[PDB]
Design a protein around this ligand. Structure first.
Ligand SMILES: Nc1nc2c(ncn2[C@@H]2O[C@H](CO)C[C@H]2O)c(=O)[nH]1
Ligand SMILES: Nc1nc2c(ncn2[C@@H]2O[C@H](CO)C[C@H]2O)c(=O)[nH]1
Ligand SMILES: Nc1nc2c(ncn2[C@@H]2O[C@H](CO)C[C@H]2O)c(=O)[nH]1
Lengths: 288, 288, 288
């Protein structure tokens, strides 16, 4: 939708195909800090967005923004290190351009990760929250990636989202966590997207808690939306990098320029979590 | 406001006038599926949007999108078959362009219909919900049809909406329903507009229920807003085409590509409901 | 961010500097009706937006829209009479352009006033509500002034807002109110921004009350956001000009074209409130 035409996607995917011998099945999208997951791929083939045809280039930050094709624990992946966000200024049709390319590349599963602040008090920074559902606040106002004329070549005008985050994949991630003897249980909740780059205020934090969100972030939802729109199996998770402040006594103050949590404890715990899951993603071959 | 100037409206309305001998009093806007209401007009004069001067043409769908001037049960109408929506990509000033044209055509009443999913559990698919009020979610973020410099020739900078849906008309619709011996009572609630084309997720569904909405749709509100802004008496209703899924056990999944409900039971029940109401719309002549 | 470059701000501020001998410390932004506060400045030097370089000109209303440099109770001010709003059509980067200019002018404190309707029932029209916090509804959808690439020359990509409204300034405003023997206590609450020019509907009014807002307005928040983003000490207040209607029995109807409240009782009570506070704003010299 908008700005890009089917041809564009078709050309980016083809150029990609004719530039890598890897035919990816699973596309992983690395959220803030969770980028080194690319390091553990094998037969890795790296493309910086910039060199790829119709691919949105990353803003100012020339310290990342690449598409790494590889193999992770048996699965042929394609990892987008450094996602695009609304705050950077991108129209959602750009933010989610890669998700449609992945589809044309043959990807049938998209696992999206992100760093989210925590609204549910049981969460603790470092916790990993499996996304059971989302609340797409921007989409309410009209900030939806599917806006504009619908290309029946990708999907429906009115795709359903009640079933976004794969019920099976979630089942497995939970088990996989247990069979890792973790102690701190895999959390499960609802991720709420908020666009603006600034961080929540206590009042905002409280409306989000009342609305039913468990984690608040500034990404993922547009991708999940267009993935599901074109059929991709979606599974994703949030890394609780910080308890959002719900009291005026606050004292503490939200900081991103502290993308620690993610690179800290998480860095490993999560990238290994992701690897074993590759095993749990059904092979397009499977059968028995 | 924006994109169109007073002249534009003035010209479209005039060209219309000088192209139909009908001087409409009531303008009806047919929501999804509820379009055949046009079939029951008499002295019908059809104009496909396309042939009308500054009239937003419908997107891809070349299977409808027309303005039918006629007489319905004594009233001289003008029905817009196939409304415009945000999801199609239209700026709200286009979505609502026809409402201002209607005003310049002499229309003093606008009855808007739509197909809405149901958040209130007492509703049943097929139920007709009289709109007692709305929650304009997009307008909160800035997606308001009145945005931009205000033309005092149409109305106020800051029009009030506490009184949108005519209190009288509602009274009458209720009575009219009774004097039709219906059994299933005319429901009454608050319609919440959500823009994006995709359907709600369970979490989204739950925030809407908590927010106070009874039905959720993707239209009507911009029209009501600009109608009321220029003085039009507004009365409208929702056809509950589906109970939105509020549980994760879901199983069922929202489908539009099932615009059945509307064409089913509703098709008639509602178009006849609309006809008797023409009688209840006060004549610009009336007096006693 | 967007539309304007650092140079632009730098040039507007410089031209300003080289056109006034006043080096302002406190920048006050006058909300609807609260504009005559400019009248009480001394050594007043007036610039109508229009004559200032990259300064957004006011829309149609040629009956105000000026920047008045002066001295108020000892402090060297710069008052923006007539703020810019989203409803007028301005992109937030324009609405908030002056806030960045103020920063480059040397301003270290921004006090924003506005006229807000009241959702909390304890409030009474005429009441002054100190803003303890805000809920930036537009920013949720993406309507954030910081959107677009972040200029590290002004601030952070992800500034925090949990601490927006200065805790000290609030303490003082309260005391200052007491030492004015007012009787009707200075209220304190959360201001919720709503963009659209139209007024709330009862359902909308109720979701705002449920969301936790105390007052609803159509300004201030973008300014507070970019002020805080570039470090300005922010303190602001709402003048409850009208109890927003929370019942369907309504009868009454919201009117702006009744900017009375503000010019009435408030006109004075508030502008004198503002003057004594100048005394309470710490001098960039201070020390003991
Ligand atoms: N809105 C929001 N985004 C957060 C929070 N914690 C982490 N994030 C995420 O990290 C980046 C900002 O550091 C982008 C956003 O996806 C939070 O508390 N609130
Ligand atoms: N958002 C939303 N729109 C709905 C729903 N049911 C019917 N609709 C309405 O029908 C069309 C999509 O089929 C456009 C929208 O006005 C629903 O459950 N949710
Ligand atoms: N949304 C809203 N803005 C209000 C209200 N009362 C005052 N206002 C404020 O005054 C102007 C409209 O008259 C712009 C807005 O900042 C109110 O009840 N609702």
């Amino acid at each position: 939708e908008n700005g890009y035409t089917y041809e564009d996607y078709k050309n980016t995917a083809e150029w990609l195909l004719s530039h890598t011998k890897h035919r990816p099945q699973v596309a992983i999208i690395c959220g803030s800090g969770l980028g080194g997951l690319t390091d553990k791929l094998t037969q890795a083939q790296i493309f910086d967005y910039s060199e790829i045809p119709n691919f949105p280039r990353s803003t100012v930050p020339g310290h990342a923004g690449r598409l790494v094709f590889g193999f992770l624990n048996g699965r042929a992946c394609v990892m987008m290190q450094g996602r695009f966000h609304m705050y950077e200024g991108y129209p959602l049709w750009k933010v989610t351009f890669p998700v449609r390319v992945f589809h044309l590349l043959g990807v049938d599963t998209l696992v999206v990760t992100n760093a989210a602040g925590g609204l549910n008090p049981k969460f603790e920074v470092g916790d990993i929250m499996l996304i059971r559902d989302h609340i797409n606040l921007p989409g309410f106002s009209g900030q939806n990636p599917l806006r504009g004329p619908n290309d029946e070549r990708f999907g429906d005008r009115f795709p359903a989202m009640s079933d976004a985050y794969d019920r099976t994949m979630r089942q497995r991630a939970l088990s996989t966590w247990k069979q890792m003897g973790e102690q701190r249980e895999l959390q499960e909740g609802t991720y709420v997207m908020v666009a603006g780059p600034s961080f929540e205020t206590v009042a905002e934090c409280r409306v989000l808690q009342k609305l039913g969100a468990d984690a608040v972030g500034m990404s993922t939802v547009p991708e999940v939306i267009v993935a599901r729109h074109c059929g991709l199996r979606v599974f994703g998770f949030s890394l609780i990098t910080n308890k959002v402040i719900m009291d005026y006594e606050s004292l503490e103050k939200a900081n991103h320029e502290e993308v620690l949590a993610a690179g800290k404890q998480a860095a490993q715990k999560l990238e290994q979590f992701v690897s074993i899951l590759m095993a749990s993603i059904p092979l397009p071959d499977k059968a028995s």
